[PDB]
Amino acid sequence: QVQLVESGGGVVQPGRSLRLSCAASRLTFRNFGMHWVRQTPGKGLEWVAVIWHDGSNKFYADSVEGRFTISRDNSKNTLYLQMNSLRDEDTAIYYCAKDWGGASDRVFDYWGRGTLVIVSS
Amino acid sequence: QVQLVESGGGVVQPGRSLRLSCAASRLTFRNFGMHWVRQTPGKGLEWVAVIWHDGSNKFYADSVEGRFTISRDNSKNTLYLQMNSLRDEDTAIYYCAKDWGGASDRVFDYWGRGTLVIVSS
Amino acid sequence: QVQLVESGGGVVQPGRSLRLSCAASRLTFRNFGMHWVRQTPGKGLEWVAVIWHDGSNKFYADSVEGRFTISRDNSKNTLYLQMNSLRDEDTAIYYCAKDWGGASDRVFDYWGRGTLVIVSS
Amino acid sequence: QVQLVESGGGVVQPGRSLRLSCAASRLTFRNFGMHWVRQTPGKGLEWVAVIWHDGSNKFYADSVEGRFTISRDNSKNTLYLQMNSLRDEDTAIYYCAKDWGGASDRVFDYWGRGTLVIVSS
Amino acid sequence: QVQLVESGGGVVQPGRSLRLSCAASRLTFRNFGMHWVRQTPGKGLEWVAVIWHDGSNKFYADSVEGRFTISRDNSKNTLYLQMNSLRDEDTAIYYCAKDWGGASDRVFDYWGRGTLVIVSS
Amino acid sequence: QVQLVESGGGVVQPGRSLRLSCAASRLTFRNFGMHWVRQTPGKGLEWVAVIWHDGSNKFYADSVEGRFTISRDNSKNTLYLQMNSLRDEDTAIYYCAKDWGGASDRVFDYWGRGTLVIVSS
Amino acid sequence: DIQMTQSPSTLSASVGDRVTITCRASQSVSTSLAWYQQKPGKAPNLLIYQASTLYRGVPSRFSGSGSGTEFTLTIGSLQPDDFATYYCQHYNSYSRITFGQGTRLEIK
Amino acid sequence: DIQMTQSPSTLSASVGDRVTITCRASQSVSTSLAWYQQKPGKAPNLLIYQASTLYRGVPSRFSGSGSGTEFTLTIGSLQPDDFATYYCQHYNSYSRITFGQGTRLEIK
Amino acid sequence: DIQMTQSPSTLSASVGDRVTITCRASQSVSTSLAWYQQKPGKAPNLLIYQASTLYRGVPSRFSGSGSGTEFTLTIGSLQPDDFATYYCQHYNSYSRITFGQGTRLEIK
Amino acid sequence: DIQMTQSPSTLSASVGDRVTITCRASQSVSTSLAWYQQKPGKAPNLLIYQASTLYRGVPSRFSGSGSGTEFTLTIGSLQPDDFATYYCQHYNSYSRITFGQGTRLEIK
Amino acid sequence: DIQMTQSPSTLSASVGDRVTITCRASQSVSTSLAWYQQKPGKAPNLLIYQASTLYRGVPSRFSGSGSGTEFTLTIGSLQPDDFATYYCQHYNSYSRITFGQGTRLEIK
Amino acid sequence: DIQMTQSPSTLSASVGDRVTITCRASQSVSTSLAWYQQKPGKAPNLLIYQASTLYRGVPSRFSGSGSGTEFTLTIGSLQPDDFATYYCQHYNSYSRITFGQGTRLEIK
Amino acid sequence: DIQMTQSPSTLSASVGDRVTITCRASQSVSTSLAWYQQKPGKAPNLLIYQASTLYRGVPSRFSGSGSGTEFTLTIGSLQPDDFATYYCQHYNSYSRITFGQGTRLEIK
Amino acid sequence: ANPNANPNANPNANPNANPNANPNANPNANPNANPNANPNANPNANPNANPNA
């Protein structure tokens, strides 16, 4: 039916790193591009990144350029987003995603549950 | 002259599973990609799935993603489509198909006869 | 100097079967692939089939898929093709061939003379 | 966090050639077009050139048209600007740039440190 | 340093055709529109024609409407003006030109060397 | 050399419609507005319509206001004037025309050959 | 996905007539189309691929043409056999395979 | 980027009513919009894509229309399950994906 | 519109003489005139624009003069080829373009 | 090209004050302007884009305004860290990138 | 499959001249082209593989060239024994082998 | 077309004086005028554009002024290299580019 | 078959020099290339296999490098006993063994 | 009024066109890629296999 379960959350100090995973199930992982969507505590939705089906290209929102890196590895059916140089803004609920696959339509259908990341002291 | 017979249909309850077979005869099975085409009783034709010649890649229509799993076994020369978590919009006649073999032409030329799959109560 | 002897032809009615042989001479049959080439009365060359060096894989043209069967016997130095379910368009001079052996070049060097098959009533 | 470091400056007599590099770090270099900005010792700011993401198109300020050649190499994650037929007006501090990536705004966000080029005798 | 060299000159009888070239060097020819300027033996200057950067639109002086056709080949970095139905008043030195690149200033800066065309018998 | 060839004439009864064409050749038709000029059998000339270069504006003589419609097809390099509710006064040979191109001179230079349109019963 | 629209839904004709069936695309699909004929109770078979090429074994009476989003299936002289349901199929790259609703040929 | 602004910030209505939610674009985005419904405690789901096309499995009471910078999500008959947060999301080419603030639907 | 009256209607002259064609506008047209020459069976050709400027390629024997409502076209030395019908045209701003009745030059 | 003139060349003020720096264009640049702050020894940093929008991470005490050729950058309350050289840069379509002279803020 | 079209179908020439035969491809074949010459009563013999490389024992007057869809087989000097039917054959990857129609070169 | 008349045709002058060259337009050209200097045997070089702006690389002793129809080019201190033929060129909107007759500078 | 080209054909050098001989294959041969030395009157002897690996008993002054299509033999210090003919050989899978043309090292 | 085109309109390219890659491409595999095997794959045996016991 396709469910996305994300993991790797926790609370970290500003300036430290953190690894996230989006181990997927029952989905044809290699055939679809994926996104990461960030929802701030103020109930605002913000897009973060996107990796193509084979990992050729990546695009990042300017809010995370040079700090976030996504990597896809088809073999174990999982998606990664590793974070560097976090700050107080980066505290939000992190959703996984899966692009619908349209010819030119960038929309998310099978959202994940959400993994919480806290940056504080 | 290239006949594709399908079997394994019947009537099942919603949410139950069922297996389909597309045992082929006299066709060079291992050298041809194959498809599954669904025809609703409303006379509409919809493509469902396709599997490459060694099964390296599998593609599904979005309406059936995560629910239908298809596979090919060259050794005994048959094609399978395993059905999971069905619902009332899967009542239709299911056609096996064979990709023509064009360099960029994805068209079906030797269709199977078709096996009826019905889900109701 | 490698000469290819082909036989088994004649005149057959539509829908009847026929067997063609391509017994070889002084050529290393096992290490070379083989091709059947059909030369229509309208001065056209149509490729028919190719068999691998040990018979592992087998290809056909679209017009002869499922109706033609080729086989390779390394033991007595011959290439075999069984011809089934014929109609009028198969009436042509049938050429045997041998791929040159390049890494990626499917080019015939030592053509056979040809055995002519008539489909008539 | 994305830092841009330049190199290749020094002292050149008028009329000699010179190559300038903008090797980038942690920036998704291939997705972003890059500019060169020249600051004269008189604290004036002049724009030099721009190269697109794939290098398809280039644009130069008229003061360096035909004398300056800029080239981008995505594989080594670096940018090149080659200078030919320099004169007294080309002695300045050279900054790299990175277009912000918006739809229609040509603004620079991650400037480099700067490399000094001196034309004298 | 941007040099434009013209060629194709000579002598022709009235009513005959002739082709002219403006093979450019070291200029980003694709980004710039170009003009042809004709200098009569009486030392007068007449503007002839202009073509846009991609050849979308062309404009001609009324003295050469329907007899002169200008075309641009961005791939080979060159400009063409083909003249038909010549007469005595078209005997002059033909100058290639390059629009300055300003927002609204249609002014030529980098002229060519010049090609002499003689129409006589 | 700029030739304007018209067509679509003939004889029609009053109250019927009729379409005229002004297929041009060798002219940069897209960059020039064009006129239709009517020459009555009394050898007097009357202006009919003008169409701007891109079709933005149209102007008609009061004697043809609301009955004549002029449209231009830049892609096909042709000019159209379709008349509706014709009457006896509209018997005349219809000329195409091309505005000279001056800043403020609406003067016709390259007239067409002429098409005779007759209205009678 | 791409929605395939073929018009008319149902048009009747007599033997020997000329009937043309169109297929409309939501956006450009290059020239990668395929026309299918389905006699009632039978799995459908291929007539045209690449939107203009006649498949082998199909009579030359069937004819297709068009590019972009305009594609038409033209029958030179409709015969009693050709009374069936006609489908237009697309296989544009990076887009999933869809079909039309199905035009019906009805006698007289 | 392109700023997604939708109005009103909060719209309260009762069951059986008809509500329209408008989203304003900072600049033209053609027709590449989407509408998402976030029920609290759950990740948002897809309702509309291409600003006019109903997704698969969404009730037909949801309607979307508009082009350029003025777009509207219309609910034909508000139902007891349809109280949640609504966002407008655009995916125009050469511009990054942005979301709106999100309108709250509050009972009566 | 502005009615144009040119006189004389017919002006007989011989080769080598000097003729003057006058074109009187009913109201001031500033300097926006044009003079056309029509040879029988041919579309009329432009001779003078702006009422004084020679068009390209016209023999210099034609001269235009006048302003306001009174304008003259003068042929310095009438040539055998210059026997034809002449029309004067105005294109004054905010007014519609009208032509003259037509002055004829007759041999001898 | 389009020359950019910013006034005044030098403007001195103390902490807690409010200052406005203008930028005057030779011709209309619509709203395609940007403001840069360069501290000595460092490359300039982006402050405003689209002539009114605040760039990410910049303190909100800066405000931009203006359209056409007259534009204003206003610092609401001067701070000890806001003493540097300010440049106005335009990116009008079909025109090349130019910068202003550079206004200097001097303490007291 | 690729329709592999060679033009001209028949071209006459006399011994000693230069004759060139080309073959058109429906879509790109890169450089996997082959040429065969067929004298009457004999199976075709290979001349060129890789669209440019002369096979062993092939006279040097035989020469192939071209890439993509445009290819040319050029005769250095036509000889009396070079009068036969010539074919173009491609072996593109993931595609089936097809031949040309066959060009006939005839005496005088 | 707009025919440019630059007056006077020739000024003799010596090294060190001040010379003014005028260019008169038949109708308003706003400020869209450019001045060219042609030394014999060479293609002309750009000096002034927009009738008041100095082109890059041109010595500052050249200065242009005027708007409407009266435009003057002034060389403040003539130098031995500055002896050449000078052309004034207009590029007014909706009108084609034309050049002046060419003023010459003669030593002594 | 795979055709390699080794350049230069002949390279003269003195004792103590450093010489590099290349071997260019018609198509990528991975690392399946081997080099040989052949003295006059003697059969060629192997130098390097896997295009980089030294054979037992071969002096360490011989070193091989390269992959794909471009490979090189390098002798770091030429000694008097290394004057001979050196060839390159490929053994790519699914390809037959063919052999190079030859670089010759000649004294001074 | 002047009905013709403006022959002095800006004919040059746009040096401020968006110099970036499209962040919203079609980031998916191609479902209509050739799913068949290559009929022109080399059907000959390898002469370079190990000839030793």
Coordinates of N, CA and C in Angstrom, one line a residue, chain I:
Chain I
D1 N -13.9 62.8 -43.2 CA -12.7 62.8 -44.1 C -12.5 64.1 -44.8
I2 N -11.4 64.2 -45.6 CA -11.1 65.5 -46.2 C -11.2 65.2 -47.7
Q3 N -12.1 66.0 -48.4 CA -12.3 65.8 -49.8 C -11.1 66.5 -50.6
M4 N -10.6 65.9 -51.6 CA -9.5 66.4 -52.4 C -10.0 66.7 -53.8
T5 N -9.7 68.0 -54.2 CA -10.0 68.4 -55.6 C -8.8 68.9 -56.2
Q6 N -8.4 68.3 -57.3 CA -7.2 68.7 -58.1 C -7.6 69.2 -59.5
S7 N -7.0 70.2 -59.9 CA -7.3 70.9 -61.2 C -6.0 71.2 -62.0
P8 N -6.1 71.2 -63.3 CA -7.3 70.9 -64.2 C -7.5 69.4 -64.3
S9 N -8.7 69.0 -64.7 CA -9.0 67.6 -64.9 C -8.2 67.0 -66.0
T10 N -8.1 67.7 -67.1 CA -7.2 67.2 -68.2 C -6.3 68.3 -68.6
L11 N -5.0 68.0 -68.8 CA -4.0 69.0 -69.1 C -3.2 68.4 -70.4
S12 N -3.6 68.9 -71.5 CA -2.9 68.5 -72.8 C -1.6 69.3 -72.9
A13 N -0.6 68.5 -73.3 CA 0.8 69.1 -73.5 C 1.6 68.2 -74.4
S14 N 2.7 68.7 -74.9 CA 3.6 68.1 -75.8 C 4.9 67.7 -75.1
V15 N 5.7 67.0 -75.9 CA 7.0 66.6 -75.3 C 7.9 67.8 -75.2
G16 N 8.6 67.9 -74.0 CA 9.5 69.0 -73.8 C 8.9 70.2 -73.1
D17 N 7.6 70.3 -73.0 CA 7.0 71.4 -72.3 C 7.1 71.3 -70.8
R18 N 6.4 72.2 -70.1 CA 6.3 72.2 -68.7 C 4.9 72.3 -68.2
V19 N 4.5 71.3 -67.4 CA 3.1 71.2 -66.9 C 3.1 71.4 -65.4
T20 N 2.0 71.9 -64.9 CA 1.8 72.1 -63.4 C 0.5 71.5 -63.0
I21 N 0.5 70.6 -62.1 CA -0.7 70.0 -61.6 C -1.0 70.5 -60.2
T22 N -2.1 71.0 -59.9 CA -2.5 71.6 -58.6 C -3.5 70.7 -57.9
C23 N -3.3 70.6 -56.6 CA -4.1 69.7 -55.7 C -4.5 70.5 -54.5
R24 N -5.8 70.9 -54.4 CA -6.3 71.7 -53.4 C -7.1 70.9 -52.4
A25 N -6.7 71.0 -51.1 CA -7.4 70.3 -50.0 C -8.5 71.2 -49.5
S26 N -9.6 70.5 -49.1 CA -10.7 71.3 -48.5 C -10.3 71.9 -47.2
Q27 N -9.4 71.4 -46.4 CA -8.9 71.9 -45.2 C -7.4 71.6 -45.0
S28 N -6.8 72.4 -44.1 CA -5.3 72.3 -44.0 C -4.9 70.8 -43.7
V29 N -3.9 70.4 -44.4 CA -3.3 69.1 -44.2 C -1.8 69.2 -43.9
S30 N -1.4 70.4 -43.5 CA 0.0 70.6 -43.2 C 0.9 70.3 -44.4
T31 N 1.9 69.4 -44.3 CA 2.7 69.0 -45.4 C 2.6 67.5 -45.7
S32 N 1.6 66.9 -45.3 CA 1.4 65.4 -45.5 C 0.6 65.1 -46.8
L33 N 1.3 65.2 -47.9 CA 0.8 64.8 -49.2 C 1.6 63.7 -49.8
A34 N 1.1 63.2 -50.9 CA 1.8 62.2 -51.7 C 1.2 62.2 -53.1
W35 N 2.1 62.1 -54.1 CA 1.7 62.2 -55.5 C 2.0 60.8 -56.2
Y36 N 0.9 60.3 -56.9 CA 1.0 59.0 -57.5 C 0.8 59.2 -59.0
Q37 N 1.6 58.4 -59.8 CA 1.4 58.4 -61.3 C 0.9 57.0 -61.6
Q38 N -0.3 57.0 -62.4 CA -0.9 55.7 -62.8 C -0.8 55.6 -64.3
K39 N -0.1 54.7 -64.8 CA -0.1 54.4 -66.3 C -1.3 53.4 -66.5
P40 N -2.0 53.6 -67.7 CA -3.1 52.7 -67.9 C -2.8 51.2 -67.8
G41 N -3.6 50.5 -67.1 CA -3.4 49.1 -66.9 C -2.5 48.7 -65.8
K42 N -1.8 49.7 -65.1 CA -0.8 49.4 -64.1 C -1.2 50.0 -62.8
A43 N -0.8 49.4 -61.7 CA -0.9 50.0 -60.4 C -0.2 51.3 -60.3
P44 N -0.7 52.3 -59.6 CA -0.1 53.6 -59.6 C 1.3 53.5 -58.8
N45 N 2.2 54.4 -59.2 CA 3.5 54.4 -58.7 C 3.7 55.7 -57.9
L46 N 4.5 55.6 -56.8 CA 4.8 56.8 -56.0 C 5.8 57.7 -56.6
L47 N 5.6 59.0 -56.6 CA 6.5 60.0 -57.1 C 7.1 60.9 -56.0
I48 N 6.2 61.5 -55.2 CA 6.5 62.5 -54.2 C 5.8 62.1 -52.9
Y49 N 6.5 62.3 -51.8 CA 5.9 62.2 -50.5 C 6.4 63.4 -49.7
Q50 N 5.6 63.7 -48.6 CA 5.7 64.9 -47.8 C 5.6 66.2 -48.7
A51 N 5.1 66.0 -49.9 CA 4.7 67.1 -50.8 C 5.9 67.8 -51.4
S52 N 7.1 67.5 -51.0 CA 8.3 68.1 -51.6 C 9.4 67.1 -51.7
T53 N 9.4 66.0 -51.1 CA 10.5 65.1 -51.1 C 10.4 64.1 -52.3
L54 N 11.5 63.9 -53.0 CA 11.5 62.9 -54.1 C 11.6 61.5 -53.6
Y55 N 10.7 60.6 -54.1 CA 10.9 59.2 -53.8 C 12.1 58.6 -54.5
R56 N 12.5 57.5 -53.9 CA 13.7 56.8 -54.5 C 13.4 56.3 -55.9
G57 N 14.4 56.5 -56.8 CA 14.4 56.0 -58.1 C 13.5 56.8 -59.1
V58 N 12.9 57.9 -58.7 CA 12.1 58.7 -59.6 C 13.0 59.7 -60.3
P59 N 12.8 59.9 -61.6 CA 13.6 60.9 -62.3 C 13.5 62.3 -61.6
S60 N 14.6 63.0 -61.6 CA 14.7 64.3 -60.9 C 13.9 65.4 -61.6
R61 N 13.2 65.1 -62.7 CA 12.4 66.1 -63.4 C 11.1 66.4 -62.7
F62 N 10.7 65.6 -61.8 CA 9.5 65.8 -61.0 C 9.9 66.6 -59.8
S63 N 9.0 67.6 -59.5 CA 9.2 68.5 -58.3 C 7.9 68.8 -57.7
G64 N 7.9 68.7 -56.3 CA 6.7 69.0 -55.6 C 6.9 70.3 -54.7
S65 N 5.8 71.0 -54.5 CA 5.9 72.3 -53.7 C 4.5 72.6 -53.2
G66 N 4.5 73.5 -52.2 CA 3.3 73.9 -51.6 C 3.1 73.4 -50.1
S67 N 2.2 74.1 -49.4 CA 1.9 73.7 -48.1 C 0.5 74.2 -47.7
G68 N 0.0 73.6 -46.7 CA -1.4 74.0 -46.2 C -2.5 73.4 -47.1
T69 N -3.2 74.1 -47.9 CA -4.2 73.6 -48.7 C -3.9 73.7 -50.2
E70 N -2.8 74.2 -50.6 CA -2.5 74.5 -52.0 C -1.1 73.8 -52.3
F71 N -1.1 72.8 -53.2 CA 0.1 72.1 -53.6 C 0.2 71.9 -55.1
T72 N 1.4 71.9 -55.6 CA 1.7 71.8 -57.0 C 2.7 70.6 -57.3
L73 N 2.4 69.9 -58.3 CA 3.4 69.0 -58.9 C 3.8 69.5 -60.3
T74 N 5.1 69.7 -60.5 CA 5.6 70.3 -61.7 C 6.6 69.4 -62.4
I75 N 6.4 69.1 -63.7 CA 7.3 68.3 -64.4 C 8.2 69.3 -65.2
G76 N 9.5 69.2 -65.0 CA 10.4 70.1 -65.6 C 10.4 70.0 -67.1
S77 N 10.5 68.8 -67.7 CA 10.6 68.6 -69.1 C 9.8 67.3 -69.4
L78 N 8.6 67.4 -69.9 CA 7.7 66.2 -70.0 C 8.3 65.3 -71.1
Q79 N 8.4 64.0 -70.7 CA 9.0 63.0 -71.6 C 7.9 62.1 -72.1
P80 N 8.2 61.4 -73.3 CA 7.1 60.6 -73.9 C 6.5 59.6 -72.9
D81 N 7.4 59.1 -72.0 CA 6.9 58.1 -71.0 C 6.1 58.7 -69.9
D82 N 6.2 60.0 -69.7 CA 5.5 60.6 -68.5 C 4.1 61.0 -68.8
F83 N 3.5 60.4 -69.9 CA 2.1 60.7 -70.2 C 1.2 59.6 -69.5
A84 N 0.5 60.0 -68.4 CA -0.3 59.1 -67.6 C -1.2 59.9 -66.7
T85 N -1.9 59.2 -65.8 CA -2.9 59.8 -64.9 C -2.2 60.0 -63.5
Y86 N -2.4 61.2 -62.9 CA -1.7 61.5 -61.7 C -2.7 61.7 -60.6
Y87 N -2.5 61.2 -59.4 CA -3.4 61.3 -58.3 C -2.6 61.9 -57.1
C88 N -3.2 62.8 -56.3 CA -2.6 63.3 -55.1 C -3.4 62.7 -53.9
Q89 N -2.6 62.5 -52.8 CA -3.1 61.8 -51.6 C -2.7 62.5 -50.4
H90 N -3.5 62.6 -49.4 CA -3.2 63.1 -48.1 C -3.3 62.0 -47.1
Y91 N -2.4 62.1 -46.0 CA -2.4 61.2 -44.9 C -2.3 62.0 -43.6
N92 N -3.0 63.1 -43.5 CA -3.0 63.9 -42.3 C -3.5 63.2 -41.1
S93 N -2.9 63.5 -40.0 CA -3.2 62.8 -38.7 C -4.7 63.0 -38.3
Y94 N -5.3 62.0 -37.7 CA -6.7 62.1 -37.2 C -7.7 62.1 -38.4
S95 N -7.2 62.1 -39.6 CA -8.1 62.1 -40.8 C -7.8 60.8 -41.6
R96 N -8.9 60.4 -42.4 CA -8.8 59.2 -43.2 C -8.2 59.6 -44.6
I97 N -7.5 58.6 -45.1 CA -6.7 58.9 -46.4 C -7.7 58.9 -47.5
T98 N -7.7 60.0 -48.3 CA -8.5 60.1 -49.5 C -7.6 60.5 -50.7
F99 N -8.1 60.1 -51.9 CA -7.3 60.4 -53.1 C -8.0 61.4 -54.0
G100 N -7.3 61.9 -55.0 CA -7.9 62.9 -55.9 C -8.6 62.2 -57.0
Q101 N -9.2 63.1 -57.8 CA -10.0 62.6 -58.9 C -9.2 62.0 -60.1
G102 N -8.0 62.6 -60.3 CA -7.1 62.1 -61.3 C -6.9 63.1 -62.5
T103 N -5.7 63.7 -62.6 CA -5.4 64.5 -63.7 C -4.8 63.7 -64.8
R104 N -5.2 63.9 -66.1 CA -4.8 63.2 -67.2 C -3.9 64.1 -68.1
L105 N -2.7 63.5 -68.5 CA -1.9 64.2 -69.5 C -2.1 63.6 -70.9
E106 N -2.5 64.4 -71.8 CA -2.8 64.0 -73.2 C -1.8 64.6 -74.2
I107 N -1.3 63.7 -75.1 CA -0.3 64.1 -76.0 C -0.8 65.2 -77.0
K108 N 0.0 66.2 -77.2 CA -0.3 67.3 -78.2 C -1.6 68.1 -77.7

